[PDB]
Amino acid sequence: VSPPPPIADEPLTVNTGIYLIECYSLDDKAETFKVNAFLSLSWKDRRLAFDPVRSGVRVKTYEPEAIWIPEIRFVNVENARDAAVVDISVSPDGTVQYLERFSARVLSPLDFRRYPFDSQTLHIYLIVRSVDTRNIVLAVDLEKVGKNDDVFLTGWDIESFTAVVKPANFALEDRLESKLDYQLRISRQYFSYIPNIILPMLFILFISWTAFWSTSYEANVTLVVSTLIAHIAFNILVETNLPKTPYMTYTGAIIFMIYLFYFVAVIEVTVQHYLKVESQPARAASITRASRIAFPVVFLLANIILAFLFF
Amino acid sequence: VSPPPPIADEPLTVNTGIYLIECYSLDDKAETFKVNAFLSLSWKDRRLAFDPVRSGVRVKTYEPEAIWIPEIRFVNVENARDAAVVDISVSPDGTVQYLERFSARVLSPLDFRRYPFDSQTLHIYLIVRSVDTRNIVLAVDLEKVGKNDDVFLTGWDIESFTAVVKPANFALEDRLESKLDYQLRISRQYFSYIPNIILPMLFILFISWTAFWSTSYEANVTLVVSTLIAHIAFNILVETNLPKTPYMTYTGAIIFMIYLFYFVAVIEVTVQHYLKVESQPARAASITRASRIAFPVVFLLANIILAFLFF
Amino acid sequence: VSPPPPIADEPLTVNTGIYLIECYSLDDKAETFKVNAFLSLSWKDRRLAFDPVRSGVRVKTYEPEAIWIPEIRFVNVENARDAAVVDISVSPDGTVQYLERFSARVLSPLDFRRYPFDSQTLHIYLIVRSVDTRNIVLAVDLEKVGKNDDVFLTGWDIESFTAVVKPANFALEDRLESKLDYQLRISRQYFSYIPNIILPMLFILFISWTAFWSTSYEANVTLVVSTLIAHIAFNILVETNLPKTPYMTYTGAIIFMIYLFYFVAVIEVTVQHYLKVESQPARAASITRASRIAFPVVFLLANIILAFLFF
Amino acid sequence: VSPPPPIADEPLTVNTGIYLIECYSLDDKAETFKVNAFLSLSWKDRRLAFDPVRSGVRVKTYEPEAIWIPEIRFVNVENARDAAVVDISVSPDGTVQYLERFSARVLSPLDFRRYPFDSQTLHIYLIVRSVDTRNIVLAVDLEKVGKNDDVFLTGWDIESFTAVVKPANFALEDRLESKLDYQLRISRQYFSYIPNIILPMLFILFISWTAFWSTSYEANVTLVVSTLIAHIAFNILVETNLPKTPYMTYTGAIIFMIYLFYFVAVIEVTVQHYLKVESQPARAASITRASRIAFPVVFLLANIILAFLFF
Amino acid sequence: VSPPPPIADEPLTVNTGIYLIECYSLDDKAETFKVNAFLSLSWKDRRLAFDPVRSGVRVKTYEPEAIWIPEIRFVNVENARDAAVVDISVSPDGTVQYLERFSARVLSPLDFRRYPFDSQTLHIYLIVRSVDTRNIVLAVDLEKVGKNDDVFLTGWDIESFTAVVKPANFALEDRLESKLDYQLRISRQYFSYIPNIILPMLFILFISWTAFWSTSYEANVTLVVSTLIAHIAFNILVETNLPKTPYMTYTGAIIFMIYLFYFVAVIEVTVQHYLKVESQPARAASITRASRIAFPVVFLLANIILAFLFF
Ligand SMILES: [Cl-]
Ligand SMILES: [Cl-]
Ligand SMILES: [Cl-]
Ligand SMILES: [Cl-]
Ligand SMILES: [Cl-]
Ligand SMILES: [Cl-]
Ligand SMILES: [Cl-]
Ligand code: NA
Ligand code: NA
Ligand code: NA
Ligand code: NA
Ligand code: NA
Ligand code: NA
């Protein structure tokens, strides 16, 4: 079979629409998500036109094999989509209405800069390669773009599912390609991070600061070193749920900065002891008394500065 | 092939039934479960009717290819079900009795609020898209809905497998869809959580409270900090077996609250020492003596309050 | 094609046999094992009978397509078995000898009560659904049931592979089903558990008891708390290799009971110190001296009681 | 199609050859390896003989469907090999030259006794089931058995890839089976184990022995217990990269034996303290002085004994 | 179908080109990467030639089935590539222009010597087996070799994608093979390693050196042993993200060398204490004072030496 013939030198417009049924498995490390949706296609093939009076029927159904169907592919998919044709319906003028149900693992990159308070725009790119007979251009039928109300992406809030109506028409391997951008706007459910990582991490830091109300070096060493190890465990736990980024993430910055607070606490604890031993407990007392105010104040201000730079 | 013709303008009723053979792999993190069941379908096709006297036979068997079979799909499945036809049997009036054995990874969400003392309702949604010739409506043949006695879901108790008999009939992409709800009610086997997480976690907390019967700061610091680290390990272990929820789980709340008890224990231990050093061991004694009663009482009451809010 | 016709009202006997080639991947957490075997089937179809004198040949080979083959399925498989037909041979009387090689992930539950000193009976259930023409019953041809000598299940000892010769005939969805039970009896290779978990766990416990020969509270606190943390690591390591059971496992019981020994050691260590501080080291000496005998004796007796209840 | 007819009562010889292209994913825990190779087959079928003068073509190419091809299977594979036919070439005498490229997950057991200084012989077993017309026997065409120079198995050194030329001809389910043994000899690259496990493990042990030059019980308890915990982590890390063996591995033995050294160090540390407290520091000094020589000497000799028993 | 006939004794040149659409999942442990690209093939088949005047058309489109297409395979792929034909276009002279879109898991080895400051050359090898009619040779059409601008390999910087234009022509199993080398040059994004592993690891080492400003043996033992355990955790974390190499990696060397610094710190701490006890605190003071300069200086120089050897 060959593509539909042009009335004049116009390109063939394939109207598209994606309707999400099930949306799942957003892997932060892999920057992938799995989708299960309907793909609807519509184009006019005058060769398929019929008189409803003579034929009796108002619409004609065809098997994919019987007629010409545009070779529509997804750009950013991992492997070729699993698709199964639901329906092909031809109206008297020759307007074909294709429907298929597909599933694919979509590869759309993520911006972890504000993690876990981040919002993402997932992309689904539809593309079509022009044949030698005629150029094929994609379009968006907005009435056939949507999502089910039940659509839930675990740990995420689905904001919108829309399409950039004007396609990106460009040359590739000496033939015209028409690309369409379907955007799924989502925002992370940060709630769990607060009682599981953020607050536990702050509690262990504040416990390290009880060393500023203790003259026992052996006890201080235990307090600051033990809590530093729990902070290492939280750093490791966090960096497992995330990929290696060439930039600093919000949680990454806080986690990093907290190491400096542990390092300065070890210095203060060491200075206090050296001075006590050197028979200068008065000077050690001044440093310890100052640290009690300095550490919380510098921690609070540094955090205001970070939140400001990141948001 | 085309769908059966209507006697009048009535829709075609496809009677359904699911009989679970094997139920397995409930992934809490993924909110998925795997099923292996029989799917039975029954509808009347007058075109297939025959006289049992003239034909000799009481029922006629057909291969799927020979006759019209309704396109039945699952809504909340991950990928398309794996199915294999067991039997197709036609009675003299034209009543078709289809049977297939399928397997699918079903995506039904879970409510972890009362974890690990939670009960779930897993869903299996059957759907059918109406064709242009006539509208197709689903029904439940209750005699063909059930589960095998051997059906075991590891770590769960299977309560019931029933179907909501009235289908959800709605419009989707300008065609009628008939959805059916099969509900598998299950309840978690919480027993293992008690000797593996709950009791070990309480033992480490009570060990931290032996610091209220000790005047040794060095020893107390070790007791409260070491046990706090073991509590961090239990928090991490628990949050690995669960997905990130936008709400507080029962175990999540207890685990979180226990951090506050560790934090206040560090404060008491610090106060006692500061006072002892400041040559006020009498005042430190009063605080330590009070803490011995305060800590268990506040822990017990806070737990009554939590159990009340959650159950 | 239709099933063989009955001489009288007797059911059709399909003689079966499974010969294991490769047996592997026993997942304790999932309660599954993978199998790679031969499935042999034999039934008489008089329609296929021939005279060896007239036909020249002693046996006739047929392709699955050509003749009627009973639809045999596995009950407890995860997905439908992967099978490939090796041979179909018809003798002059019409006796068909079918052979196929298959692989399947079999789902047979396990009893972890005596873990890691447990023995299991893995099951492979063959089933057949009766057609309307005639009822089909399964049988065991014992000469065609066996296993290869090389068959090795990693970490397990294969005791026997036998079949329960009388099938379980029952009604299901108003049709006779003939189920057969193939039993693979295996016993765990517990050897590795001894130097990797059991002996390391006992060594850390005995190290905690060196606190009964020490008056140093700071040192005792370190001894009992540090070793308690290593016991937590062993509890976590063990519960990862096992699923969540609604009953107590042997290792689970020992692991749990050992927590009580750590808890009582913390109490003794605390009592000794309180008494020493209260200027009563004589009374603290009596308690410490008693604990040196009490702890090993109670540990040894409690273990005799547990081994008795479990074996 | 039927198998080639015999000139006399001779069996049909299928000449085989495996040429490894890619060798990868050797899973120690699963005792599996993945292979990507060429499988070449050659047999004479006089029915395919042709005159090159009359036919125009020296050799004729056929699609697998067109002619009889022996059903060659792998014994020790997990699932059926993924294969794709490269070429089928028939010479005028009827000699068929089959070529296919396949990939399979081969299940060949491993001997971890000398781990990580072990050498393995991986096996690939080719088999063929005799048909009723005539018996089929396998052979090795040594010119068509080899491996690519680029063939690299991560963490292993590939020594040789050869075939045991004489097949194992045996009876199975009353039919002759011809098995062939392809052996891939490999040896582990132990180098990484030295700076990652062996040397770190020895360093922590030697650190524990600095307790023989210390009279501080509190410090010794910390030294021996802390380093014992690091040894537990190395034991856990090692047993994760390995399956549960019914025998003692070399690393397993060293790791186990080192626990006894930690246990005896705890005893010495306890004895020294008891004696110091009992006002017998002279006797405690003798024991501590002896331990300084005893511990390294017994460790060195025990290791000579182990290396001797294992190598 | 047979291959195109030669004008003379020349081989058939198949011009190739790979254009990367999506590049993803570079597994350091497995030494694999997943690719999703276009594969373009072009060769002359005079049998397909046509007069554009007589035929009307300028180019003729064919289905893969209709004409002869060279069997092109990838050498270093794991399983056979998943491919789907985009287009086949024949020009009047008989020049075929084939295009397919494929996905494959490519197995190309990596050099971890300079990890995480390493650069790699990933390879994609195209190959073709000569038929008996005529020899097939590969070529590079440079205009049809490229990559998409969006192509992102997580944690890596894509430098270039080029092809070694001269094929490797060699004999294999008595037939000519034409291999082509496509090279993807990438360099690791080391940035994340700095705040997550390198700086945390240096902070814990510097904390261990605060023992040179402390006379408290109990505190020093805690400082050096606790920080040594955190270094063990970083060693374990690092060796999990990497495969077992028969050579020393850059991070591996630094990590190893840091163990020696911990070992010597334990010796100094032990010597200081022995001397203090032996009533020689003056000599212990000299050693401690020297260590304060020696440790940072030797650490800094040893690192200069390592960076020099590795870069
Ligand atoms: Cl696609
Ligand atoms: Cl489905
Ligand atoms: Cl099955
Ligand atoms: Cl019954
Ligand atoms: Cl019946
Ligand atoms: Cl195979
Ligand atoms: Cl390929
Ligand atoms: Na078509
Ligand atoms: Na049908
Ligand atoms: Na059949
Ligand atoms: Na064949
Ligand atoms: Na072709
Ligand atoms: Na300590």
Author numbering:
A (entry chain D), B (entry chain E), C (entry chain A), D (entry chain B), E (entry chain C): 5 to 315
Copy text from the publication.
At present, the best structurally characterized pLGIC is the G. violaceus ligand-gated ion channel (GLIC), of prokaryotic origin. However, the GLIC is a pH-gated channel, activated by lowering the pH, with a maximal activation at pH 4 and a pH50 around 5.
The mutant of the vestibular pair on the β5 strand, D86N-D88N, yields a significant decrease in pH50 greater than 1 pH unit. All residues were also tested individually, with most mutations having no significant effect, although a large majority tend to decrease the pH50 (notably D86N/A, D88N/A, and D91N). Mutation of Asp/Glu residues at the complementary (−) face, in general, decreased the proton sensitivity of the GLIC, with additive effects in many cases, especially for D88 and D86. However, the pattern of phenotypes does not allow discriminating whether those residues are involved in proton sensing or gating, because mutations to Asn/Gln also produced decreased proton sensitivity. A structural analysis was performed on E26Q, E26A, E35Q, E35A, E67A, E75A, E82Q, E82A, D86A, D88N, D88A, H127N, E181A, and H277Q mutants, by solving their structure at pH 4. All structures were in the apparently open conformation.
